[PDB]
Design a protein around this ligand. Sequence first.
Ligand SMILES: O=C(Nc1cc(-c2ccc3ccncc3c2)ccn1)C1CC1
Ligand SMILES: O=C(Nc1cc(-c2ccc3ccncc3c2)ccn1)C1CC1
Lengths: 347, 341
Amino acid sequence: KVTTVVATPGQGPDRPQEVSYTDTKVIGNGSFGVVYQAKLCDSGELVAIKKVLQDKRFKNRELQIMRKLDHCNIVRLRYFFYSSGEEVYLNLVLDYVPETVYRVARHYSRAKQTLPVIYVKLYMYQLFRSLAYIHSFGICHRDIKPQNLLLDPDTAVLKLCDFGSAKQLVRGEPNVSYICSRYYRAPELIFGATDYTSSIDVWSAGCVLAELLLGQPIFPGDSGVDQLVEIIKVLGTPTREQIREMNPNYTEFKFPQIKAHPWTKVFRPRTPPEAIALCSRLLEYTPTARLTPLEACAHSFFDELRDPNVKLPNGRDTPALFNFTTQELSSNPPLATILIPPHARIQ
Amino acid sequence: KVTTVVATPGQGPDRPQEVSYTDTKVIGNGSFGVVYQAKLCDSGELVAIKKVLQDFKNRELQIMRKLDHCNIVRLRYFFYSSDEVYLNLVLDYVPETVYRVARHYSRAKQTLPVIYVKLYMYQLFRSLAYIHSFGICHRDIKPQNLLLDPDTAVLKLCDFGSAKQLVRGEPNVSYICSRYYRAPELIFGATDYTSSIDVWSAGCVLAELLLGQPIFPGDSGVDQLVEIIKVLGTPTREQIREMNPNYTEFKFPQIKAHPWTKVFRPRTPPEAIALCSRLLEYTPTARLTPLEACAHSFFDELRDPNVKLPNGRDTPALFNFTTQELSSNPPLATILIPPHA
Ligand SMILES: O=C(Nc1cc(-c2ccc3ccncc3c2)ccn1)C1CC1
Ligand SMILES: O=C(Nc1cc(-c2ccc3ccncc3c2)ccn1)C1CC1
């Protein structure tokens, strides 16, 4: 069954093209709708088609955001088009990526092994770079989690996906507190704050890092109260001040009174001290105290990636990690001093 | 081998007794601590010992010492043990949970027989009627917290670690209650909610037993809300206002309500569907009270003098209401207590 549509390219000027695809199969369901895998007739390349009901009232926010993004660590929007399906549907045609951090982490966990630190470095670095890029537009993802981190195992390339929760945050304009997924929610979201910032993504990324190092989620729980107890067990009880910077009116509630557990005793003995240091600077109560994504990229944990001699275990080169644009560096241009190693500067 | 402690009876005055037990095994871990199973030397009876770090006074203990009801797990004893100090709550052990039983049916591609849906939900609503009459809200109603004896079909409500006596005008944390079972006012982060959040959670359990899977799934509040809206339709401004003000002016999926009949399988009893629709209401004050739910027609079969369990035994005691239990609406007694009781 060959399907043919006239679709609009994700990037560049509006110049629709005939696109034919076949071998359609479902690779995902959700509240949003359905994600299909398909094969393009022209090139044989695989795509993922995210199909969602289209609101008659306004432009789709996810589409508007994805048409603005162009970055090697963000899943590319190849085309989009509208169609029927019983009401009108928006179809987002994305590059298909063969793996996710969720699935890879599960494979190691079930095999009683941990992902090699070199991959933890590579994946988390690319995640932080994707965040530096979107944040520089004021855009917050709001649902960072392993299932939304696509991986190409052969090239070790990570790509951020699912911009269905993403939003341009504006200071003084309220946002829904109920975004972000179980295990990965910043404490200010748990406290129901509506005035949060892009640093909620940095907390979520910190949970992903911790999880890759531990082999399991660092703050599990099916309720916010369970998640908060797990957080308090590590960070200790938050001060009245720390509570004020997460959500006022949570000032006077009764919290568990636990002393902070030393970060080193959280992870296995073999865990590199730089990884632990990095976790502690991401997983901070006070949102403005967390590292920015660009500062995270510059962290000592990623020094190995900047070594001119670094290679993948496959033998392959690492992906391009150093070609930062002015846009990517804009939150703190002199960080390029660290971010771009001497060998990446040879003319 | 054998552990001997000096434990305080859960009810009655503080007169500690020597209590010995054996065969201790772990039956659960959580954010709170650990739950052990043990066997009492005196009676051979099985108990669950919940062990939590002790701080101020323990709210869960204070609440449980006040409760005495056949559909709430009994606090037999409590005791302290050890460089910190732990509170140990000694509970009656119950062999099964609704979580585990629903899973067994789901995995077998079968539905739990409606007679058990009636029995279990009725007893849950009785337990809620009882605790709500003290002003106490459980705040974590879910299948894992619903213990079952499969031989007698008795259900007992458990885990009061989130429970609180709600006081009008005094804020409460919004972040209680578990994924799938949270009332929309909680998802919206409300701090001024009422005991009707337990009724929403109960409605989700009822729908799940009928469907064979949770009715409002999703790992984020936004996904859960979408699933809710797909069934109830988009909430109105007023309905939002009754859930949480300032969540007005937010953009919501503009979806029309789904006919409750088409939510469930064709086999589903219409009274089950009617009851569901009266529990899962956006406006918290529009939801049925637990006592009203007990009196709903869906449970009429339980009030039949000829009703029996599928294993051949009589049903457990369903009609032994106290004044306290009926206090939200005493005239319901004429429905709740049938002529043959
Ligand atoms: O799922 C895979 N690859 C993949 C998934 C997607 C993909 C999957 C689920 C989504 C849900 C919501 N929004 C976007 C989504 C994109 C996109 C590209 N490649 C492979 C592991 C099978
Ligand atoms: O778990 C079972 N029975 C059981 C569990 C409990 C039980 C289990 C977990 C809890 C967690 C928090 N608070 C109270 C809890 C009580 C109590 C009595 N009986 C049977 C399925 C094995």
